[PDB]
Design an enzyme around this catalytic site. Structure first.
Site, PDB file in Angstrom:
ATOM      1  N   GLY A 101       0.800  -1.211   0.000  1.00 58.71           N
ATOM      2  CA  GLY A 101       0.000   0.000   0.000  1.00 58.71           C
ATOM      3  C   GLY A 101       0.835   1.264   0.000  1.00 58.71           C
ATOM      4  O   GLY A 101       0.445   2.271  -0.595  1.00 58.71           O
ATOM      5  N   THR A 109      -0.376  -3.827  12.017  1.00 62.79           N
ATOM      6  CA  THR A 109       0.323  -5.100  11.919  1.00 62.79           C
ATOM      7  C   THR A 109       1.838  -4.958  11.859  1.00 62.79           C
ATOM      8  O   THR A 109       2.527  -5.973  11.703  1.00 62.79           O
ATOM      9  CB  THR A 109      -0.153  -5.869  10.678  1.00 62.79           C
ATOM     10  OG1 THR A 109      -0.070  -5.020   9.524  1.00 62.79           O
ATOM     11  CG2 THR A 109      -1.588  -6.347  10.855  1.00 62.79           C
ATOM     12  N   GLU A 166     -13.178  19.108 -10.048  1.00 60.99           N
ATOM     13  CA  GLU A 166     -13.911  19.986  -9.142  1.00 60.99           C
ATOM     14  C   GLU A 166     -13.505  19.772  -7.689  1.00 60.99           C
ATOM     15  O   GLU A 166     -13.493  20.728  -6.907  1.00 60.99           O
ATOM     16  CB  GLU A 166     -15.412  19.770  -9.303  1.00 60.99           C
ATOM     17  CG  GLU A 166     -16.210  21.052  -9.439  1.00 60.99           C
ATOM     18  CD  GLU A 166     -17.690  20.797  -9.636  1.00 60.99           C
ATOM     19  OE1 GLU A 166     -18.475  21.083  -8.706  1.00 60.99           O
ATOM     20  OE2 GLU A 166     -18.067  20.299 -10.717  1.00 60.99           O
TER      21      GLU A 166
HETATM   22  N1  GTP Z   1      -9.503  -0.038   7.507  1.00 58.45           N
HETATM   23  C1  GTP Z   1      -8.796  -1.090   7.103  1.00 58.45           C
HETATM   24  N2  GTP Z   1      -7.438  -1.129   7.331  1.00 58.45           N
HETATM   25  C2  GTP Z   1      -6.711  -2.191   6.923  1.00 58.45           C
HETATM   26  C3  GTP Z   1      -7.312  -3.256   6.271  1.00 58.45           C
HETATM   27  N3  GTP Z   1      -6.351  -4.162   5.986  1.00 58.45           N
HETATM   28  C4  GTP Z   1      -5.165  -3.692   6.440  1.00 58.45           C
HETATM   29  N4  GTP Z   1      -5.380  -2.476   7.033  1.00 58.45           N
HETATM   30  C5  GTP Z   1      -4.375  -1.593   7.643  1.00 58.45           C
HETATM   31  O1  GTP Z   1      -3.306  -1.449   6.729  1.00 58.45           O
HETATM   32  C6  GTP Z   1      -2.065  -1.492   7.406  1.00 58.45           C
HETATM   33  C7  GTP Z   1      -1.264  -2.671   6.879  1.00 58.45           C
HETATM   34  O2  GTP Z   1      -1.188  -2.537   5.482  1.00 58.45           O
HETATM   35  P1  GTP Z   1      -1.701  -3.674   4.472  1.00 58.45           P
HETATM   36  O3  GTP Z   1      -2.596  -3.065   3.415  1.00 58.45           O
HETATM   37  O4  GTP Z   1      -2.387  -4.807   5.194  1.00 58.45           O
HETATM   38  O5  GTP Z   1      -0.312  -4.170   3.832  1.00 58.45           O
HETATM   39  P2  GTP Z   1      -0.116  -4.339   2.247  1.00 58.45           P
HETATM   40  O6  GTP Z   1      -0.592  -3.096   1.530  1.00 58.45           O
HETATM   41  O7  GTP Z   1      -0.839  -5.574   1.772  1.00 58.45           O
HETATM   42  O8  GTP Z   1       1.482  -4.454   2.075  1.00 58.45           O
HETATM   43  P3  GTP Z   1       2.283  -5.818   2.394  1.00 58.45           P
HETATM   44  O9  GTP Z   1       1.362  -6.860   2.982  1.00 58.45           O
HETATM   45  O10 GTP Z   1       3.389  -5.498   3.366  1.00 58.45           O
HETATM   46  O11 GTP Z   1       2.874  -6.338   1.109  1.00 58.45           O
HETATM   47  C8  GTP Z   1      -2.361  -1.636   8.882  1.00 58.45           C
HETATM   48  O12 GTP Z   1      -2.292  -0.367   9.491  1.00 58.45           O
HETATM   49  C9  GTP Z   1      -3.774  -2.170   8.916  1.00 58.45           C
HETATM   50  O13 GTP Z   1      -4.447  -1.758  10.080  1.00 58.45           O
HETATM   51  C10 GTP Z   1      -8.679  -3.229   6.035  1.00 58.45           C
HETATM   52  O14 GTP Z   1      -9.235  -4.165   5.458  1.00 58.45           O
HETATM   53  N5  GTP Z   1      -9.413  -2.139   6.455  1.00 58.45           N
END
Ligand code: GTP
Ligand code: ACP
Ligand code: GDP
Ligand code: CA
Ligand code: CA
Ligand code: CL
Ligand code: MG
Ligand code: MG
Ligand code: MG
Lengths: 423, 435, 319, 61
Positions: free
Chosen positions: B146, B179, B254
């Site tokens: 992400g 995490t 916008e």
């Molecule tokens: N609101 C919300 N937060 C999420 C969710 N899944 C993960 N997170 C948050 O995202 C962060 C972790 O990033 P992830 O998106 O799980 O990691 P990733 O983007 O898959 O990257 P890598 O697994 O390291 O390759 C943490 O702060 C989590 O609390 C979700 O389904 N909803």
């Protein structure tokens, strides 16, 4: 995804066998490799440790290594002895005589290539190998000497994979030979450089637990392995069942290892068993953090926690779990370093271990671990200043300089922990 | 009509994207098989809902979306889920091993070997657009994918689509569900590299969503499913103007014109009300829900707008709302609350009303309400979230804790202090405008 | 076991508070930068309010109201009174004041045309001498103060007010008069015009010890000399002024529905004229206490502001 | 407090209420990614070189 398990030497094979007995039961795998469980959670991540053979039979991704056949013969005829892949038994006949030099430089070098052939065949069948898992002791010759040799060879061939070990540390209270400090000091130097994660399993702590807590008048190696098996199942739960936290070896390392050399973990387990009254979440939390529940004979209050991973198993209130984990953190916040915010992570798993409805497993990267390396260093020096018992090693081609360098690097490791204990 | 492509990166982006497209389908009457009985132009059309959905000759309404994750378990739930029929295999991209919560692993090591594929799959969607507006990018700050891969993707999108707008929906890290200990590092690294490429970013602090779920939905321990369904509502309220007929925020340009006078300060604060439990109710009025837009307890990011200054404010109502009641509520609120605008902005509100009240997932935690509102206000108070994040960064980086993991992936240690220095200038930019 | 941190080592008030908190056995002090605290005795300047209330499992409390500087900075107070309808331009208990930069001067010159003013920031009959001196404020100097006898000397009244997390306004029953030992002179010498404790200690200590007259003595004086009481002649106006100021800013600084909670001790300085009318002079956000009142007040701070949020196992007047 | 730009449609209406008046190129990206890639390959070459020195020490013993 896939993990390749290796167990070397008497200790490594005896604890490794028990490890496969325990998680096989948790995943519903019988001694024949057939599944007989009642939940899909058991099979969702089974390929991390098991290969699926023909007929939907599961075979551990395990390689058994030793320089003498004795201990591995008993494993093959043990309870779950028939589950292991026969080709994955790699053994010599001469033994290592509790001699690190024999395992690392002479006897072990003659056998290491055939072990790597088996490792290569397993890795090649992995859709996406993530790393290796080694069980061994540091006080003997094969697990200590040939085990660290294998790690070095494995890192050369898979340098971008994670290396994880369960390393049993020697203790005069549970000793086989006087040269255990030599073999252990030589091994720690290897582990500092060539592993990412090492669970320090101290036979001094295992003995004290069996004697003081479990009230076992005369503990046996079997009693010690009961504690090791429970600890190993606990710290690998996140790898074996669905979860968000530390679900693979690399993510665990990223959360636990702030500096590359400081990767030696202090494991703990609760409740300590050898009872029908299930504990409470508050009781699991207190015992899990209690020094009497630590598998490395080090007082956490003599140092500070760099990072902590907590795993709760069983059907319990997650709300109450988070409240209690925040409780212990907010009350003893001085023992957690302030320069790593939120360094305590908690995972929960619904499936409890066999015989218990609730359990907790502790994994701490504490600077107090330096007491363990200090103990080994003193025992090492007491003999080395008189060069006692060194002929066993020079006779295999080693020079005294190599001992001096191993001693120096472990003293450096101690001082590096003390550096961050005062930060 | 002008198309919008949604891009979902990492676990957070993917799982939130799932809950959004489920909600979109419910709002537009699209079924899990992709059929839309109310759509009489079979196989085509340039309606407002076509901004997010293309149409096949067989009548399937297909999201203009691409899902990308460096590990397959999360996107595999999409391939086998309820709305599996909606999506096209080319839309779901999965790798082998993930970024291990390491920005550098997602941006450099793994991002370099999958970036070309993702762009090619995005190109396949763009080629189906008669007039592409831009992209909506969903991702977390704390994840390795992400954070790391998103920043790389945003860089290349500015190259391949220089004139197109890009909006972010970003998940700000909260320890209660985080995490990884290094999430402060990843958050600041991706913000630095992405800042010049994002035109408007909507931050959502998991801490805020977590407490809203605990306090207003009486969920003792919210999960990602609870959090994502609430996030889906806010996201839906923000994108409703692009998917339905209207005259406010009808194109991505916008959002920038109305909410972002200064390019760098492009993080509007979102506030949503009412959040009512399905297990429970007296329906709240226009004045009560509008007044709730100024309670910190209802903001997507906990902070105190009273001690900052507004640059723009947009009110997005859904349900039984008429302009008369909106102005009676605003007037009442100006006399009871501290609402200070920057001297060089008009003290006012842009108001949009959609008569269709919020749609709620059957079996969800949210109760159906007759009227709801989402306020988008660009206030300097949101910088409180940057200060928190930068402080945690400073604590770990002063000791170089975990830095070796990033250098081992080919990143230079200088990028840490480069990104932190950019965040320092950002905090002072807010301070200059806020005082 | 509750936890707290100390980040203003130069505060006599809360140095005693922390000593009391420790003496209870149920409070443990952490280091300055440990974020896992229940109570923050924060710094006076640049207090990081944005990092409070973001610790799971911890109810966090701080001893300062964010935004209360509006009332405690001299220039801000003038603006607050003249721009707030609650207080309004035609405020009868605040001296005519104007904010001017080295702004508002054309309005000061108009009213200029008794005419002695005072310039200050956080005394001359000619405005030229005031502007040449000069961010500052100029307000009318109260030329007919109430003069204590024997002595024929000036004074000012200090009142301590505690606002808790629920925005209850508590007036410490014990005030103090910072008196002057030099007789008031209607015609540059500041010792008889300024009643500050530091200025007086540099005739000091003749009439009262340390030029501090407390309410019991001052009340007995108003009864013996002016046939009235401190309650009727002065204290009703003080309580009215305290409420007006704090209720005016309540919507801006309240922490009622915030993720963290605030309380704060305030020091109100008043001025009484010969007609027994009370005038507000300044509000101090970080005040000190009288030596003989530290124990009682600081204990009251623990009881009302801290223990109410963090209970263990009245000296205030509630306005 | 004036209302401005009122637009109405079947699905809703919008308006404005005023209370009071007042990049790097593709090549440069490829170099960054390749620069980091070369640093990874250099770090690995140093590892394998260091392990090769241990191999010859093992033969010498
Ligand atoms: N609101 C919300 N937060 C999420 C969710 N899944 C993960 N997170 C948050 O995202 C962060 C972790 O990033 P992830 O998106 O799980 O990691 P990733 O983007 O898959 O990257 P890598 O697994 O390291 O390759 C943490 O702060 C989590 O609390 C979700 O389904 N909803
Ligand atoms: N409008 C006025 N009329 C008459 N006397 C005044 C006055 N303004 C100030 N004084 C007198 O001059 C002195 C100046 O003190 P001031 O009001 O500026 O507070 P200060 O901040 O300087 C000291 P502290 O913070 O301890 O209260 C007052 O104590 C008062 O006796
Ligand atoms: N916990 C445990 N420790 C063992 C066991 N067997 C040996 N050890 C320890 O390991 C060391 C001896 O090493 P060992 O494994 O027997 O020699 P190796 O076969 O050459 O590796 C000593 O410190 C023993 O205390 C065992 O079954 N369990
Ligand atoms: Ca031989
Ligand atoms: Ca159509
Ligand atoms: Cl373009
Ligand atoms: Mg043995
Ligand atoms: Mg992921
Ligand atoms: Mg003052």
């Amino acid at each position: 995804r896939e993990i390749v398990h290796i167990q070397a030497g008497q200790c490594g094979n005896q604890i490794g066998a028990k490890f496969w007995e325990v998680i096989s039961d948790e995943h519903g795998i019988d001694p024949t490799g057939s599944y007989h469980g009642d939940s899909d959670l058991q099979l969702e991540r089974i390929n991390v440790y098991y290969n699926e053979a023909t007929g939907n039979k599961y075979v551990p991704r395990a390689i058994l290594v030793d320089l003498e056949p004795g201990t591995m013969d008993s494993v093959r005829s043990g309870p779950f002895g028939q589950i292991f892949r026969p080709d994955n038994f790699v053994f010599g006949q001469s033994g290592a005589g509790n001699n690190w030099a024999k395992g690392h430089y002479t006897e072990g070098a003659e056998l290491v290539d055939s072990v790597l052939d088996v490792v290569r065949k397993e890795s090649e069948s992995c859709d996406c190998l993530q790393g290796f898992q080694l069980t061994h002791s540091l006080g003997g010759g094969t697990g200590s000497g040939m085990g660290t040799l294998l790690i070095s060879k494995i890192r050369e061939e898979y340098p971008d994979r994670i290396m994880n070990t369960f390393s049993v540390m020697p203790s005069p209270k549970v000793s086989d030979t006087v040269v255990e400090p030599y073999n252990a000091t030589l091994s720690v130097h290897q582990l500092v450089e060539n592993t990412d994660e090492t669970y320090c399993i101290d036979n001094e702590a295992l003995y004290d637990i069996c004697f003081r807590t479990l009230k076992l008048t005369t503990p046996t190696y079997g009693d010690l392995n009961h504690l090791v098996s429970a600890t190993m199942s606990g710290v690998t739960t996140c790898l074996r069942f669905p979860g968000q936290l530390n679900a693979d070896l690399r993510k665990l390392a990223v959360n636990m290892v702030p500096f590359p050399r400081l990767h030696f973990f202090m494991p703990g387990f609760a409740p300590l068993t050898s009872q029908y009254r299930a504990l409470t979440v508050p009781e699991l939390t207190q015992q899990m953090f209690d020094s009497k529940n630590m598998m490395a004979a080090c007082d956490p209050r003599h140092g500070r926690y760099l990072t902590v991973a907590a795993i709760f198993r069983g059907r319990m209130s997650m709300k109450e779990v988070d409240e209690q984990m925040l409780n212990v953190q907010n009350k003893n916040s001085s023992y957690f370093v302030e320069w790593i915010p939120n360094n305590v992570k908690t995972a929960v798993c619904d499936i409890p271990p066999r015989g218990l409805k609730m359990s907790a497993t502790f994994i701490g990267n504490s600077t107090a671990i330096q007491e363990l390396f200090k103990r080994i260093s003193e025992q090492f020096t007491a003999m080395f200043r008189r060069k006692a018992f060194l002929h066993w090693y020079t006779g295999e081609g080693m020079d005294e300089m190599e001992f001096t360098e191993a001693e120096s690097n472990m003293n450096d490791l101690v001082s590096e922990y003390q550096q961050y204990q005062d930060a | 009509m002008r198309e919008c492509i949604s891009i979902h990166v990492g676990q957070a982006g993917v799982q939130i994207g799932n809950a959004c497209w489920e909600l979109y389908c419910l709002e537009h009457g699209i079924q899990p098989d992709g059929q839309m009985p109310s759509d009489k132009t079979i196989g085509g059309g340039d309606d407002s809902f076509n901004t997010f959905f293309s149409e096949t000759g067989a009548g399937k309404h297909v999201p203009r979306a691409v899902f990308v994750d460096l590990e397959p378990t999360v996107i595999d739930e999409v391939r086998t889920g309820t709305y599996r029929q909606l999506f096209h295999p080319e839309q779901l991209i999965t790798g082998k091993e993930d970024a291990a919560n390491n920005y550098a692993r997602g941006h450099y090591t793994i991002g370099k070997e999958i970036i070309d594929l993702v762009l090619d799959r995005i190109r396949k969607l763009a080629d189906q657009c008669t007039g592409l507006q831009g992209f909506l990018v969903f991702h977390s700050f704390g994840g390795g994918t992400g954070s790391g891969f998103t920043s790389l993707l945003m860089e290349r999108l500015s190259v391949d689509y220089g004139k197109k707008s890009k909006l972010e929906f970003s998940i700000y890290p909260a320890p209660q569900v985080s995490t990884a200990v290094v999430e402060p590092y990843n958050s600041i690294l991706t913000t630095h590299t992405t800042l010049e490429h994002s035109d408007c970013a909507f931050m959502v602090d998991n801490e805020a969503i977590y407490d809203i779920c605990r306090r207003n939905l009486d969920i003792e321990r919210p999960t990602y499913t609870n959090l994502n369904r609430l996030i889906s509502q806010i996201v839906s309220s923000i994108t409703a103007s692009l998917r339905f007929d209207g005259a406010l925020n009808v194109d991505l340009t916008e959002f920038q014109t109305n909410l972002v006078p200064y390019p760098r300060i492009h993080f509007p604060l979102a506030t949503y009300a009412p959040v009512i439990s399905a297990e429970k109710h007296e329906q709240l009025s226009v004045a009560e829900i509008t007044n709730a837009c100024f309670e910190p307890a209802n903001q997507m990011v906990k902070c105190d707008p009273r001690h900052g200054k507004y640059m723009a404010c947009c009110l997005l109502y859904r349900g039984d709302v008429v302009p008369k009641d909106v102005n009676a509520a605003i007037a009442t609120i100006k006399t009871k609350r501290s609402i200070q605008f920057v001297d060089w902005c008009p003290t006012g509100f842009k108001v949009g009303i959609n008569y269709q009240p919020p749609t709620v997932v059957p079996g969800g935690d949210l109760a159906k309400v007759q009227r709801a509102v989402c306020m988008l206000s660009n206030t300097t108070a949101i910088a409180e979230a940057w200060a928190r994040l930068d402080h945690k960064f400073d604590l770990m980086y002063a000791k170089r804790a975990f830095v070796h993991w990033y250098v081992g992936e080919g990143m230079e240690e200088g990028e840490f202090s480069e990104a932190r220095e950019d965040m320092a200038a950002l905090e002072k930019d807010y301070e200059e405008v806020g005082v | 076991m509750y936890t707290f941190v100390v980040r203003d080592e130069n505060s006599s008030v809360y140095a005693e508070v922390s000593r009391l908190l420790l003496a209870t056995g149920q409070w443990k002090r952490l280091r300055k930068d440990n974020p896992r605290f229940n109570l923050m005795l924060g710094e006076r300047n640049r207090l990081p309010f944005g990092r409070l209330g973001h610790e799971p499992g911890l109810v966090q409390l701080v001893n300062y109201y964010r935004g209360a500087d509006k009332l405690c900075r001299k220039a801000s107070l003038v603006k607050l009174i003249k721009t707030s309808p609650e207080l309004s331009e035609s405020c009868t208990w605040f001296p005519e004041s104007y904010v001017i930069y080295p702004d508002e001067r054309e309005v000061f010159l108009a009213a200029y045309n008794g005419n002695v003013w005072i310039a200050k920031s956080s005394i001359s009959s000619e405005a030229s001498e005031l502007l040449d001196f000069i961010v500052h404020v100029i307000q009318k100097y109260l030329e007919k103060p109430l003069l204590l006898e024997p002595g024929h000397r000036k004074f000012d009244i200090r009142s301590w007010v505690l606002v808790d997390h629920l925005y209850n306004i508590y007036l410490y029953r014990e005030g103090v008069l910072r008196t002057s030992s030099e007789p008031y002179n209607s015609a540059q010498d500041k010792t008889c015009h300024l009643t500050n404790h530091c200025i007086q200690k540099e005739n000091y200590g003749r009439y009262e010890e340390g030029n501090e007259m407390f309410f019991e003595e001052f009340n007995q004086y108003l009864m013996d000399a002016l046939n009235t009481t401190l309650e009727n002649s002065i204290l009703l106006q003080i309580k009215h002024i305290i409420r007006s100021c704090l209720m005016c800013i309540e919507p801006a600084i309240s922490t009622k529905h915030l993720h963290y909670q605030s309380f704060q001790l305030f020091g109100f300085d008043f001025m009484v004229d010969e007609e027994l009318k009370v005038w507000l002079i300044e509000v101090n956000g970080a005040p000190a206490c009288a030596q003989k009142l530290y124990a009682e007040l600081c204990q009251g701070i623990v009881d009302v502001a801290i223990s109410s949020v963090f209970p263990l196992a009245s000296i205030f007047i509630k306005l | 407090m004036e209302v401005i730009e009122l637009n109405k449609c079947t699905s809703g209406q919008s308006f404005e209420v005023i209370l009071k008046p007042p990049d790097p190129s593709l090549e440069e990206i490829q170099k960054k990614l390749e620069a980091a890639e070369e640093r990874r390959k250099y770090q690995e070459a140093e590892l394998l070189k260091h392990l090769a020195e241990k191999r010859e020490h093992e033969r010498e013993v």
